[model samples]
Target chain A: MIGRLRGIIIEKQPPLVLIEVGGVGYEVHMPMTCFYELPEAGQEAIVFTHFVVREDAQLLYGFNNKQERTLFKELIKTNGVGPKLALAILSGMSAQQFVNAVEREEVGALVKLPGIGKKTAERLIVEMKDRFKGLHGDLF
Target chain B: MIGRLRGIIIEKQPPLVLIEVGGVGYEVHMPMTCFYELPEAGQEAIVFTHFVVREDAQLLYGFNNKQERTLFKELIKTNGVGPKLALAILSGMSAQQFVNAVEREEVGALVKLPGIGKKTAERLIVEMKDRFKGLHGDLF
Candidate 1:
């Protein structure tokens, strides 16, 4: 239910950012794109978040904007995709580039992602194509 | 990973207290004993939190002090106990009184809590007796 975090950037260890709100440190995992957008430690910043609650773990996936957060949400809804896999996908390319790849049905582009194979790439394109319809490209 | 919240009490809906830290609101579930200690909305307060993340949901259990939070952590470690049932047990009585029940083996006192039957009450006393050893009674 945590949708946003506005706090100090306490630590930035690529893929994981520790944010201190009020004496409590929140560790948020971010894609490289989102991570690169953040300032150095001790600076204040805002992060859009998608909180993932699993049986064994709780995680906060950070994003630079609502568009990327929305893309990440749609990415995880596909079969065989979880938060980590989605982060890898987002880290490798921008939201717009991923949408372009899906539109062109470029399975090879998606296969290059760390955990995605041919089957998962095909499923991602097939599942995300419908969700991406009618959306403005600039939004991503 | 959220251990504490220092913020404004935005809402108090029995068993659930919403605290606004920075620009984000954190929804924390408090036992009746802890709930009764919070001020009305708009006032500032500090709450010790035990965050529980399950497959379907993420919840924050709040307490007035570390003693109550510690007791709650120990309570949920029992085989059949979950956060909600643990909250019920803590809500009906203070940590000290619950300790007294365990010390005296008063299963009847524990059975009074909703959803806690004779079997669960027996299990609670059996499982908690050793953990409570050498723990200062005042700590609870």
Candidate 2:
């Protein structure tokens, strides 16, 4: 739903970031990688966002850049991969590292990420590698 | 995610209204009821939007007013209803008409809408009527 937020940071709670826009505070859950790079509270920040809806909750996931946002969208398209797991994967590795791992089909490297098993690692590699195959140079 | 869009109108496609904001042209699907009221191409129009993401498409459905938008959200939240049917419902009747029908528990009025059946109409009255039994003055 929300495409981006041009606002000031109100709180930094790692996976949960609170951003206030026009006096309305929006709670966005972001990966740790983006959280580590965000400025301190009360500083200006711009974040690209992905919105998820469920039976009991509505969630907004934040990304610091388009590459991360695009990768997050791609990761969630994989079967057996939900937003929580996608966020975990993005938190564990940079987009470049993920692309390289999928390129080399490195299951060992992917399994080192938190919550990723060998089977999931192998599947993620195959699916992601296939996603970029036979396509133009849009690796990110 | 997105709450509203106040942009320039570009084209007059019945269901697909091309609205341009800055450099991006957002394709919004709106009911014919709202479409009939919109100004000619190039005029500024304000629309309340509901964003939907499916396996194959990302859609934005627009309404002229908050009550219509809110009612559309409520309609889609039911057990068997989806965004397409929600749009069809709004196209068939005004938001006030729907609220009146639900208030009277009149299944016949709801069944007159396209693709609605006896069972669905009965279920809709039962479900929607319960939604208005609240503690405050927010009936519409």
Candidate 3:
């Protein structure tokens, strides 16, 4: 298991960057928002990663953006969401914006994302509203 | 959401500790390896952590030892293993000894851990063998 890849950002094809950490190229699957502030190939950068293990296989899901990574972690645990949909959903909107959509009871904004549907959108709306219920200094 | 808590090891009660980072006490759930080299309370320490998020809550599992924490991450992904059992499994034996057991196709040492039986021990023996295979300069 890798702690992180703290080296050059060798290849970044938004939501996917192969970061060259020393002799190793650590692959980071992340959100689209990162490219708006992309790191150049020669530049040194770091990705705080989530190493997921499944049946002895090791994989890294990282984020250039902390909040997105944090919310990405949360999204996967939602009943209908996996890493695939969580990737898309997190890249689809801002964290609070999604929570805001659910907070206002507007399922319309949610289903507009590339892969989201009415049923999934409603599930997101119904479930996440409660988590968003009582955040104080923290934005859900 | 916190990658690792970088702070003092204030309150440690074997199996769990309250790691205070700033004014907030970030509670870390961990292993017996810590007591073997427990950091004095009020001295700074750091633990590589695994963050678990459920819709209702978020939790942190950590280990002061990197190899142990890394193994803990892999253990939870095994079928029929949860974080509870993973903690026990890792705390039960040294990483290399556990690897040695799997390397030799012996389940005798593994079954002595909490909640482990013949079935789980056999599974660990079979699955972890492949992971620990052919390592030149690395431990599984």
All DockQ scores: 0.22, 0.06, 0.02
Off by over 4 Å in 2: A134-139, B1-4, B7-59, B62-140
Show where candidate 1 strays beyond 4 Å: A134-140, B1-20, B23-54, B59-140
Evaluation by lDDT, superior candidate among 2 and 3: 2
Candidates arranged by TM-score, highest first = 2, 1, 3
Residue-wise lDDT of candidate 3 within B92-126, one digit each (tens)?
77667776787788878888888876898899888
Largest lDDT belongs to which candidate? 1
* Cα TM-score per model: 0.54, 0.56, 0.53
lDDT of 3 at B117: 63
Q: Which candidate wins on TM-score?
A: 2
> Which CAPRI category fits model 3?
incorrect
Displacement of residue B130 (Cα, Å) in model 3 is: 3.4
List of chain A TM-scores, every candidate: 0.93, 0.92, 0.83
Q: Model-by-model lDDT, in order?
A: 0.85, 0.80, 0.71
Model 1: lDDT of residue A100: 85
Which candidate wins on DockQ?
1
TM-score (C-alpha) between model 3 and the true structure = 0.53
lDDT per residue for candidate 1 within B57-104, as digits (tens), equals: 887888998899889999999988988899999999988889888988
